[PDB]
Design an enzyme around this catalytic site. Structure first.
Site, PDB file in Angstrom:
ATOM      1  N   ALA A  53       8.668 -23.976   4.052  1.00 33.56           N
ATOM      2  CA  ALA A  53       8.771 -24.125   2.611  1.00 33.56           C
ATOM      3  C   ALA A  53      10.098 -24.793   2.306  1.00 33.56           C
ATOM      4  O   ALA A  53      11.167 -24.286   2.669  1.00 33.56           O
ATOM      5  CB  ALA A  53       8.676 -22.768   1.925  1.00 33.56           C
ATOM      6  N   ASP A  54      10.013 -25.927   1.635  1.00 30.74           N
ATOM      7  CA  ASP A  54      11.169 -26.724   1.272  1.00 30.74           C
ATOM      8  C   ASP A  54      11.804 -26.219  -0.014  1.00 30.74           C
ATOM      9  O   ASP A  54      11.483 -25.158  -0.555  1.00 30.74           O
ATOM     10  CB  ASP A  54      10.763 -28.190   1.138  1.00 30.74           C
ATOM     11  CG  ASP A  54       9.777 -28.420   0.010  1.00 30.74           C
ATOM     12  OD1 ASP A  54       9.480 -27.466  -0.738  1.00 30.74           O
ATOM     13  OD2 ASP A  54       9.289 -29.559  -0.124  1.00 30.74           O
TER      14      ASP A  54
END
Ligand SMILES: *P(=O)(O)OCC(C)(C)[C@@H](O)C(=O)NCCC(=O)NCCS
Lengths: 50, 50, 134, 49, 72
Positions: free
Chosen positions: E33-34
């Site tokens: 997850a960025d």
DNA sequence: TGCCGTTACAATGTAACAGTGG
DNA sequence: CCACTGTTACATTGTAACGGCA
């Protein structure tokens, strides 16, 4: 930010076109001069194949 | 005077609440499409970042 | 104008609507003679996958009396299509028993509100009563 | 805005508390001054007699 | 238990399954997850529990365990 | 007016739950 | 248990009637 945004889409489209064009080739280009040489090898291959 | 601003804060809070549900539902929907599209579709085909 | 209209979509909607109506027995065309009506309907059937020509087909062979119904059906289709994207804009459909519906509508006409507005006000008053007690 | 309003409320609470304090002080002074007036009247009567 | 909320929502927000997340790992890099995704994850957690989390507290949830640590 | 959004319906189809009796 | 029935909560599409607006 707004200046960069205005510049953005042109740059992005250019990048994508170049990526497609180079990936189509086996080589990845990095310079206008590099493109010019690749063109020269293209001409040489053309005048050979013909 | 401050109580009116408190009521305005309440209005803003409910608006935020609405937006939050919107965003979370959107991410829920996106999850599966990312999962499937990771089969080279998103790589450069669908993701026309231009 | 609130919702932008898209030709390749609304035209497909119109073609599907007309085909459905024809399959239902509705006389799509203005031609009393069965032969011309059948010919026009066959043209329409083979006219699939064409907005720019289904529009012309409608202009030329369409039954005069269905124009309004088709127009309002397309209005509703457009509105629903644009509203079904987000949760808050979607609409939830339910069925109410006749006495309950009668009383609720009685309240709504009495107060001049819509069903949504009337129920919202009533729930808000119920919540307020809860808070008064609590 | 929420934190700003909360902080203003806190300031308001403090200042209201202290003014309640001054109100109590004023009441005490009022009692004292009633006593003072009573004394004045007593002294006046003593003078006249 | 109540953690079933978190360990469910996390997956629904990150594409991983319930057991994929490990408490030792970190959302930012160990889950994929960025930046945008981590904001979305924290905001979905906020929505689920009908509560609020300021920016400062929210930034200390990079690890899996923190997601329950502030909750319970 | 003519279009356009909007509401309040109608009709039918489904999934899900609750009952019922063998 | 198991099957079949009754019921609710939706969806899906269509329509008529208002009311806004150029
Ligand atoms: P990251 O590369 O995904 O980018 C994230 C983002 C800048 C788009 C945004 O979602 C974000 O993470 N912002 C950080 C928090 C922030 O800016 N808050 C402002 C509150 S007014």
């Amino acid at each position: 930010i707004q200046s960069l945004t205005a510049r953005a889409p042109v740059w992005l489209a250019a990048q994508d076109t170049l990526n497609q064009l180079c990936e189509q080739s086996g080589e990845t280009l990095a310079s206008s001069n590099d493109v010019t040489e690749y063109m020269q090898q293209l001409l040489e291959r053309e005048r050979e194949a013909t | 005077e401050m109580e009116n601003v408190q009521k305005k804060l309440r209005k803003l809070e409910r608006d935020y609440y609405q937006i939050r549900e919107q965003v979370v539902s959107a991410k829920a929907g996106w999850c599966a499409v990312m999962r499937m599209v990771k089969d080279n579709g998103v790589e450069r085909r669908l993701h026309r970042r231009e | 104008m609130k919702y932008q209209q898209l030709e390749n979509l609304e035209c497909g909607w119109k073609w599907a609507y007309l085909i459905r109506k024809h399959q239902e027995g509705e006389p799509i065309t203005k031609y009393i003679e069965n032969s011309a009506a059948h010919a026009a309907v066959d043209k329409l059937i083979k006219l699939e996958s064409e907005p720019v020509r289904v529009l012309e087909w409608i202009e030329q062979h369409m039954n005069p009396d269905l124009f309004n119904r088709m127009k309002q059906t397309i209005r509703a289709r457009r509105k629903r299509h644009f509203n079904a994207e987000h949760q808050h804009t979607r609409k939830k459909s339910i069925d109410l028993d006749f006495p309950v519906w009668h009383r609720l509508s009685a309240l709504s006409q009495r107060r001049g509100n819509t069903l949504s507005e009337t129920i919202v006000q009533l729930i808000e008053d119920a919540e307020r009563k809860e808070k008064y007690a609590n | 805005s929420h934190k700003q309003l909360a902080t203003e409320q806190y300031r308001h609470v403090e200042m209201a508390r202290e003014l309640a304090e001054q109100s109590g002080a004023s009441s005490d002074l009022e009692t004292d001054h009633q006593a003072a007036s009573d004394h004045l009247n007593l002294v006046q009567t003593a003078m006249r007699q | 238990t109540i953690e079933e909320r978190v360990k469910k929502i996390i997956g629904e927000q990150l594409g991983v399954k319930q057991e994929e997340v490990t408490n030792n790992a970190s959302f930012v890099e160990d889950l994929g997850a960025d930046s945008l995704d981590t904001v979305e994850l924290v905001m979905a957690l906020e929505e689920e529990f009908d509560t609020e989390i300021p920016d400062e507290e929210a930034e200390k949830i990079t690890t899996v365990q923190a997601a329950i640590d502030y909750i319970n």
